[PDB]
Amino acid sequence: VKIEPLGVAPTKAKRRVVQREKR
């Protein structure tokens, strides 16, 4: 669950990634 704020906003990953990545 990694997201890369570098300017890549993955709609799919982000959703899932955000929940984890962001608690």
Instruction: Provide the CB-side half-sphere exposure for 21 (13 A, CA).
Output: 11
Q: How far is CA 3 from CA 14, 22, in A?
A: 6, 10
Q: Is 7 left (phi over 0), alpha (psi -120 to 50) or beta?
A: left
Structure method:
NMR
The answer to whether the CB of 17 falls within 8 A of the CB of 4 is no
User: Which one-letter DSSP state was computed for residue 15?
Assistant: H
